Amino acid sequence: NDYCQHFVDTGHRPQNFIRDIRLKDELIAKSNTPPMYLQADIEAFDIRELTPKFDVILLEPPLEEYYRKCWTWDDIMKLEIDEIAAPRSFIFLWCGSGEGLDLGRVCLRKWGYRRCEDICWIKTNKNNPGLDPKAVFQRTKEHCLMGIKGTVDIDLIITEEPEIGNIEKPVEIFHIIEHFCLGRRRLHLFGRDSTIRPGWLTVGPTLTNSNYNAETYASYFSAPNSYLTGCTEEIE
Amino acid sequence: LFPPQWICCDIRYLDVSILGKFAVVMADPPWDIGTLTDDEMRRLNIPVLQDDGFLFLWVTGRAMELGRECLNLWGYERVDEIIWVKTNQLQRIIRTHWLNHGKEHCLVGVKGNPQGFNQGLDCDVIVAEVRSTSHKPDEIYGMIERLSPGTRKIELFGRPHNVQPNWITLGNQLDGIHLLDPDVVARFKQRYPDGIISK
Ligand SMILES: C[S@@+](CC[C@H](N)C(=O)[O-])C[C@H]1O[C@@H](n2cnc3c(N)ncnc32)[C@H](O)[C@@H]1O
Ligand SMILES: [Mg+2]
């Protein structure tokens, strides 16, 4: 049973044939900060205004390849992410499926991280069996690189390919990030109204509303709560 | 020499210029994470093996970065990345430091301007059963054959179960030297008249 040959023969991707903690989700939900969000044109906005320094940054720049205001890797690499990352902290960078797999690694090192995981979003086409001139193969997945700075999940997300023009990434990436218990200052750059989530600060150009206030946000992490992991009980 | 051919050797010392040029190179190196140092990997004379074609380079761990370096140093641009989702016999993912790992990666590099390859026939995900330690899926040979049918290919760091028609396999666990291509036989005898491949 060669699923590659089968894909050539039928258009069903091999991943179509893969056959597919409450308390911890409970503790994450209890310790989550209120959702906070800010509309900001990130190309024209001084990200140093985003304080305090973050434990986790999820970075989801809108790449050209997602469509086929887009961000090039030139634009992305010039973001000053190191200026808002805590000395011990983590990054999750959606890199797409082309040159981003290389340039996203350059970005991680530029901002002072080392890659510790490569998370693959594998897209099935069970509902619709059936580009880049350089491409050797049909591209059926995207990569989210995990980087670390300072001192039960798997590295695969499998879902059906979204309808065309839908650029959302699987919400499962948030589950993976939150299960690591990395801290409570969580930033999602280039999030949207649709991705706002408890426990996260979302910043992006298309947000319709804002509620972010730097002083209010910082008060969520003032003592005795400065070092919580996001997976333990609230302090009385 | 359509049938399988192979050379038991230390790939650090073999003069690979005797093997001619190949449409596809595939390597599964023993990255230093019986291994090769990073410098030994960088120094491999990959550049003589191809004028125009593709390189398939298996990587894990920090070789995801070292492999990219090598690929570029050797003169390739990375243009695709195959992932092998590792399953058991019932098509369930085998779960093996932050995350369990369900896959291995194979970088796809291009050199020159390959013409007449059937790009886009296969997709970049392999779903295939795990076998013994480090045994890569045979599916990749079919993908490469459909990509480049009937052309000559070379595999580095292969084991006996890797030998295939249209391939020359190099590695130190192979059994002797089995060469049938008369051009390669001639050049091998000229370079290694006493059959010995030393430093
Ligand atoms: C990762 S395993 C290759 C696995 C193979 N692709 C498979 O599917 O089974 C690496 C191989 O390189 C071989 N090797 C290590 N050092 C070598 C050297 N200096 N020269 C040639 N082969 C070497 C090892 O014996 C081992 O068989
Ligand atoms: Mg024998």
Side-chain angles (χ1 to χ4, degrees), chain A residues 1-235, chain B residues 2-199:
Chain A
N1 248 13
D2 180 334
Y3 294 119
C4 302
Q5 183 66 73
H6 193 243
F7 168 79
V8 173
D9 288 347
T10 73
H12 289 249
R13 293 169 188 181
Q15 48 264 47
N16 294 11
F17 302 94
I18 306 167
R19 291 184 187 170
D20 261 276
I21 293 166
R22 292 180 187 175
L23 297 170
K24 178 152 139 183
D25 277 336
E26 193 207 340
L27 287 177
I28 293 163
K30 286 215 188 95
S31 85
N32 272 344
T33 59
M36 282 217 355
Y37 45 91
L38 176 71
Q39 185 289 329
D41 292 283
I42 295 169
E43 69 280 55
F45 161 85
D46 177 20
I47 44 178
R48 296 189 267 84
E49 295 180 27
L50 300 178
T51 51
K53 288 179 189 312
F54 297 94
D55 304 298
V56 186
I57 299 174
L58 174 62
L59 179 49
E60 191 182 326
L63 310 180
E64 227 142 1
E65 71 190 72
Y66 295 162
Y67 301 92
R68 187 264 187 173
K69 200 275 146 154
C70 289
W71 278 62
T72 67
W73 286 100
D74 198 285
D75 299 329
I76 296 161
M77 199 177 313
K78 294 172 178 174
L79 291 173
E80 291 193 31
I81 300 298
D82 54 294
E83 299 297 339
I84 58 164
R88 293 174 188 185
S89 72
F90 299 80
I91 188 160
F92 294 84
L93 175 62
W94 284 107
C95 291
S97 60
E99 67 183 350
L101 275 31
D102 305 306
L103 297 169
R105 286 172 159 86
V106 175
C107 290
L108 258 56
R109 292 188 294 266
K110 183 182 179 68
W111 302 326
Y113 305 89
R114 54 211 188 275
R115 181 201 57 80
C116 45
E117 303 293 349
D118 185 326
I119 301 161
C120 275
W121 175 24
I122 292 168
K123 301 180 209 162
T124 57
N125 67 343
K126 295 175 188 173
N127 299 333
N128 279 85
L131 185 140
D132 172 337
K134 295 182 176 176
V136 184
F137 300 101
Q138 288 193 43
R139 294 185 182 162
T140 67
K141 50 155 175 82
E142 295 179 26
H143 294 250
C144 187
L145 306 181
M146 181 185 176
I148 179 172
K149 192 173 178 100
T151 68
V152 181
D153 282 310
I154 196 130
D155 57 358
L156 296 175
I157 298 166
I158 307 161
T159 73
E160 181 83 2
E161 187 155 286
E163 296 176 344
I164 257 163
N166 182 329
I167 61 168
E168 319 242 75
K169 307 316 183 189
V171 70
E172 287 88 340
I173 192 67
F174 286 102
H175 304 176
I176 291 169
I177 294 164
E178 295 168 353
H179 293 155
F180 286 139
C181 308
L182 305 172
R184 298 173 62 244
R185 298 163 192 78
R186 307 193 194 101
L187 172 60
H188 183 189
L189 284 170
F190 302 97
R192 304 174 295 286
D193 283 359
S194 59
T195 64
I196 288 167
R197 182 171 172 94
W200 288 83
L201 169 61
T202 306
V203 181
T206 70
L207 304 220
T208 62
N209 286 257
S210 308
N211 74 343
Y212 173 74
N213 174 289
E215 288 69 34
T216 304
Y217 186 64
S219 76
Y220 301 150
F221 316 102
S222 63
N225 299 320
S226 304
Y227 307 114
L228 301 178
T229 65
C231 290
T232 69
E233 294 187 358
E234 301 181 341
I235 299 168
Chain B
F2 185 77
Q5 301 172 92
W6 66 83
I7 304 175
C8 178
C9 59
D10 190 320
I11 286 167
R12 295 174 294 172
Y13 307 140
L14 179 67
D15 179 357
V16 287
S17 69
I18 68 177
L19 302 179
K21 305 295 186 204
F22 298 88
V24 178
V25 174
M26 181 168 67
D28 183 14
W31 302 107
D32 188 5
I33 62 207
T35 75
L36 266 71
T37 66
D38 298 358
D39 280 339
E40 286 172 333
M41 289 300 306
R42 293 174 182 105
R43 286 199 293 267
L44 292 175
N45 196 10
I46 304 308
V48 77
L49 293 174
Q50 309 191 269
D51 295 320
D52 305 271
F54 297 107
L55 164 77
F56 291 75
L57 183 68
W58 292 93
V59 299
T60 66
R62 73 165 185 102
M64 288 184 180
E65 286 72 40
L66 179 60
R68 281 173 163 80
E69 175 163 329
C70 284
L71 183 160
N72 288 151
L73 297 171
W74 298 334
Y76 294 79
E77 175 191 9
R78 190 200 59 77
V79 288
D80 259 320
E81 179 156 343
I82 295 167
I83 64 165
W84 168 29
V85 181
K86 288 153 100 182
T87 74
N88 63 17
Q89 299 294 290
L90 308 194
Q91 281 61 63
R92 294 159 91 168
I93 295 173
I94 281 165
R95 313 187 154 236
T96 162
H97 263 261
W98 298 91
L99 286 165
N100 284 5
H101 291 171
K103 51 164 172 59
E104 279 183 52
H105 299 233
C106 185
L107 313 183
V108 183
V110 64
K111 171 174 168 175
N113 249 281
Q115 303 191 44
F117 293 60
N118 301 310
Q119 295 172 227
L121 274 176
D122 278 272
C123 80
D124 55 359
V125 175
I126 296 169
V127 173
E129 287 148 24
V130 169
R131 296 179 288 185
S132 53
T133 300
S134 304
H135 194 177
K136 301 295 179 289
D138 293 340
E139 280 82 352
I140 195 82
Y141 299 113
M143 296 171 65
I144 285 166
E145 202 56 32
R146 292 187 288 280
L147 174 66
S148 187
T151 54
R152 352 165 44 221
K153 299 153 185 107
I154 186 175
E155 177 169 348
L156 308 189
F157 305 104
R159 286 188 289 185
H161 58 217
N162 292 122
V163 305
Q164 306 286 327
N166 292 330
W167 289 74
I168 298 171
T169 316
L170 311 184
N172 66 1
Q173 289 188 75
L174 300 159
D175 188 343
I177 298 153
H178 188 64
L179 299 173
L180 308 168
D181 181 338
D183 294 340
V184 176
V185 168
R187 293 191 298 255
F188 184 93
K189 277 202 273 211
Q190 164 181 249
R191 175 68 174 80
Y192 296 111
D194 298 313
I196 290 175
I197 308 169
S198 82
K199 303 218 277 318

Short mmCIF file of all heavy atoms in Angstrom, two decimals, chain A residues 34-39 49-52 54 201-203 210-221:
data_model
loop_
_atom_site.label_atom_id
_atom_site.label_comp_id
_atom_site.label_asym_id
_atom_site.label_seq_id
_atom_site.Cartn_x
_atom_site.Cartn_y
_atom_site.Cartn_z
N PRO A 34 -7.84 38.15 30.99
CA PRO A 34 -8.86 38.55 30.04
C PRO A 34 -8.24 38.75 28.67
O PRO A 34 -7.09 39.19 28.55
CB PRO A 34 -9.39 39.87 30.61
CG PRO A 34 -8.95 39.87 32.04
CD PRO A 34 -7.71 39.10 32.12
N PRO A 35 -8.99 38.49 27.59
CA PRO A 35 -8.48 38.81 26.25
C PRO A 35 -8.21 40.29 26.14
O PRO A 35 -9.01 41.12 26.60
CB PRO A 35 -9.62 38.39 25.31
CG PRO A 35 -10.69 37.86 26.15
CD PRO A 35 -10.42 38.14 27.56
N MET A 36 -7.07 40.63 25.57
CA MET A 36 -6.75 42.01 25.29
C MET A 36 -6.32 42.12 23.83
O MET A 36 -5.82 41.16 23.24
CB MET A 36 -5.70 42.53 26.28
CG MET A 36 -6.42 42.88 27.71
SD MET A 36 -5.84 44.30 28.65
CE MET A 36 -4.48 44.84 27.68
N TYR A 37 -6.61 43.27 23.23
CA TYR A 37 -6.42 43.36 21.80
C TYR A 37 -6.22 44.80 21.39
O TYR A 37 -6.76 45.73 22.01
CB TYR A 37 -7.60 42.71 21.05
CG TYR A 37 -8.95 43.10 21.60
CD1 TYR A 37 -9.63 44.18 21.10
CD2 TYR A 37 -9.54 42.38 22.63
CE1 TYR A 37 -10.84 44.56 21.61
CE2 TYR A 37 -10.75 42.77 23.16
CZ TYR A 37 -11.39 43.86 22.64
OH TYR A 37 -12.59 44.26 23.16
N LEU A 38 -5.47 44.99 20.31
CA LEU A 38 -5.12 46.34 19.85
C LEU A 38 -5.01 46.34 18.34
O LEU A 38 -4.26 45.55 17.77
CB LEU A 38 -3.82 46.80 20.49
CG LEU A 38 -3.28 48.16 20.01
CD1 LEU A 38 -4.17 49.27 20.55
CD2 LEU A 38 -1.81 48.33 20.45
N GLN A 39 -5.77 47.21 17.70
CA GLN A 39 -5.58 47.47 16.28
C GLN A 39 -4.34 48.33 16.11
O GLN A 39 -4.19 49.37 16.75
CB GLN A 39 -6.80 48.18 15.71
CG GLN A 39 -6.78 48.41 14.17
CD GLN A 39 -5.78 49.48 13.68
OE1 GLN A 39 -5.49 50.45 14.39
NE2 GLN A 39 -5.26 49.31 12.45
N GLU A 49 6.02 49.93 22.21
CA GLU A 49 4.86 50.37 22.98
C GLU A 49 4.10 49.20 23.58
O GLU A 49 3.23 49.42 24.44
CB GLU A 49 3.91 51.16 22.10
CG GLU A 49 4.49 52.46 21.59
CD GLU A 49 3.50 53.21 20.73
OE1 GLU A 49 2.28 53.02 20.93
OE2 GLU A 49 3.94 53.97 19.84
N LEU A 50 4.38 47.97 23.14
CA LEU A 50 3.74 46.77 23.69
C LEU A 50 4.57 46.29 24.87
O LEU A 50 5.66 45.74 24.69
CB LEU A 50 3.63 45.67 22.64
CG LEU A 50 2.83 45.99 21.39
CD1 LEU A 50 2.87 44.81 20.44
CD2 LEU A 50 1.39 46.33 21.77
N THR A 51 4.04 46.50 26.07
CA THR A 51 4.71 46.11 27.31
C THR A 51 3.70 45.35 28.16
O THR A 51 2.50 45.48 27.93
CB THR A 51 5.24 47.34 28.08
OG1 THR A 51 4.19 48.31 28.22
CG2 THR A 51 6.43 47.97 27.33
N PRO A 52 4.18 44.57 29.13
CA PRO A 52 5.60 44.29 29.45
C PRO A 52 6.19 43.28 28.49
O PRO A 52 5.49 42.92 27.54
CB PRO A 52 5.52 43.73 30.87
CG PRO A 52 4.18 43.08 30.93
CD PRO A 52 3.27 43.93 30.09
N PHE A 54 7.24 39.86 26.69
CA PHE A 54 6.37 38.70 26.56
C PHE A 54 7.10 37.38 26.79
O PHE A 54 8.28 37.23 26.44
CB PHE A 54 5.71 38.71 25.19
CG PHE A 54 4.85 39.90 25.01
CD1 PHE A 54 5.34 41.04 24.42
CD2 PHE A 54 3.56 39.91 25.55
CE1 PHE A 54 4.53 42.18 24.34
CE2 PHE A 54 2.77 41.01 25.45
CZ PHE A 54 3.25 42.15 24.85
N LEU A 201 -2.85 38.65 24.37
CA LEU A 201 -2.91 39.96 23.75
C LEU A 201 -2.74 39.81 22.24
O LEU A 201 -1.71 39.28 21.78
CB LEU A 201 -1.81 40.87 24.32
CG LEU A 201 -1.57 42.19 23.60
CD1 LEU A 201 -2.83 43.09 23.62
CD2 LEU A 201 -0.37 42.89 24.24
N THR A 202 -3.74 40.25 21.48
CA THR A 202 -3.76 40.18 20.03
C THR A 202 -3.55 41.56 19.42
O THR A 202 -4.29 42.50 19.74
CB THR A 202 -5.11 39.62 19.56
OG1 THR A 202 -5.36 38.37 20.20
CG2 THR A 202 -5.14 39.46 18.08
N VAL A 203 -2.59 41.68 18.50
CA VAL A 203 -2.26 42.97 17.89
C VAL A 203 -2.21 42.79 16.39
O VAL A 203 -1.47 41.94 15.89
CB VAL A 203 -0.93 43.54 18.40
CG1 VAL A 203 -0.66 44.90 17.75
CG2 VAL A 203 -0.95 43.65 19.88
N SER A 210 -10.28 47.95 19.88
CA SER A 210 -9.18 47.79 20.82
C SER A 210 -9.67 47.95 22.25
O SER A 210 -10.63 48.67 22.51
CB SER A 210 -8.05 48.82 20.57
OG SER A 210 -7.61 48.85 19.21
N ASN A 211 -8.99 47.25 23.17
CA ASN A 211 -9.16 47.47 24.60
C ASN A 211 -7.82 47.51 25.34
O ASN A 211 -7.81 47.50 26.57
CB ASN A 211 -10.07 46.39 25.23
CG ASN A 211 -9.40 45.03 25.37
OD1 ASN A 211 -8.37 44.77 24.74
ND2 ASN A 211 -9.95 44.18 26.24
N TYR A 212 -6.68 47.54 24.62
CA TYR A 212 -5.38 47.42 25.28
C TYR A 212 -5.04 48.70 26.02
O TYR A 212 -5.17 49.80 25.47
CB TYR A 212 -4.28 47.13 24.26
CG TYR A 212 -2.86 47.15 24.82
CD1 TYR A 212 -2.39 46.11 25.62
CD2 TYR A 212 -1.99 48.19 24.52
CE1 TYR A 212 -1.11 46.10 26.11
CE2 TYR A 212 -0.69 48.19 25.00
CZ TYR A 212 -0.26 47.15 25.79
OH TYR A 212 1.02 47.14 26.28
N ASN A 213 -4.56 48.55 27.24
CA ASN A 213 -3.98 49.64 28.01
C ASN A 213 -2.75 49.05 28.70
O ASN A 213 -2.87 48.06 29.43
CB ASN A 213 -4.98 50.21 29.03
CG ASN A 213 -4.33 51.24 29.95
OD1 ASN A 213 -3.53 50.89 30.82
ND2 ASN A 213 -4.67 52.52 29.75
N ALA A 214 -1.58 49.62 28.42
CA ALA A 214 -0.33 49.02 28.89
C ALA A 214 -0.31 48.86 30.41
O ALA A 214 0.20 47.86 30.94
CB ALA A 214 0.86 49.86 28.42
N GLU A 215 -0.81 49.86 31.13
CA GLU A 215 -0.81 49.79 32.58
C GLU A 215 -1.79 48.73 33.09
O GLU A 215 -1.46 47.95 33.99
CB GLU A 215 -1.13 51.17 33.17
CG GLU A 215 -0.02 52.20 33.01
CD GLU A 215 0.22 52.65 31.55
OE1 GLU A 215 -0.77 52.72 30.76
OE2 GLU A 215 1.40 52.92 31.21
N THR A 216 -2.98 48.67 32.53
CA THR A 216 -3.90 47.60 32.93
C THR A 216 -3.32 46.22 32.61
O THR A 216 -3.39 45.29 33.42
CB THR A 216 -5.24 47.80 32.22
OG1 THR A 216 -5.75 49.11 32.51
CG2 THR A 216 -6.24 46.70 32.62
N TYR A 217 -2.73 46.07 31.44
CA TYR A 217 -2.17 44.78 31.08
C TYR A 217 -1.08 44.37 32.06
O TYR A 217 -1.06 43.23 32.55
CB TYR A 217 -1.66 44.83 29.63
CG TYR A 217 -1.18 43.51 29.11
CD1 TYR A 217 -2.07 42.44 28.95
CD2 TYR A 217 0.13 43.33 28.75
CE1 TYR A 217 -1.63 41.22 28.48
CE2 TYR A 217 0.58 42.11 28.28
CZ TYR A 217 -0.30 41.07 28.11
OH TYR A 217 0.18 39.85 27.64
N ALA A 218 -0.17 45.29 32.38
CA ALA A 218 0.92 44.99 33.30
C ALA A 218 0.41 44.59 34.68
O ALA A 218 0.98 43.71 35.33
CB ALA A 218 1.88 46.19 33.40
N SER A 219 -0.70 45.19 35.12
CA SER A 219 -1.27 44.85 36.42
C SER A 219 -1.72 43.40 36.51
O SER A 219 -1.76 42.84 37.61
CB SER A 219 -2.42 45.82 36.75
OG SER A 219 -3.60 45.55 36.02
N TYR A 220 -2.01 42.73 35.38
CA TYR A 220 -2.31 41.30 35.45
C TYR A 220 -1.13 40.46 35.92
O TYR A 220 -1.33 39.32 36.37
CB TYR A 220 -2.74 40.76 34.08
CG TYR A 220 -3.96 41.41 33.49
CD1 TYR A 220 -4.11 41.52 32.12
CD2 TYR A 220 -4.97 41.91 34.30
CE1 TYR A 220 -5.22 42.10 31.56
CE2 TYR A 220 -6.07 42.52 33.76
CZ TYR A 220 -6.20 42.60 32.39
OH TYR A 220 -7.31 43.19 31.85
N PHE A 221 0.08 40.96 35.78
CA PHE A 221 1.28 40.18 36.07
C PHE A 221 2.06 40.76 37.25
O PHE A 221 3.18 40.34 37.51
CB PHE A 221 2.16 40.10 34.81
CG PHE A 221 1.37 39.80 33.58
CD1 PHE A 221 1.05 40.81 32.69
CD2 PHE A 221 0.90 38.52 33.35
CE1 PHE A 221 0.28 40.54 31.55
CE2 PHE A 221 0.15 38.23 32.23
CZ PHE A 221 -0.17 39.25 31.33
#
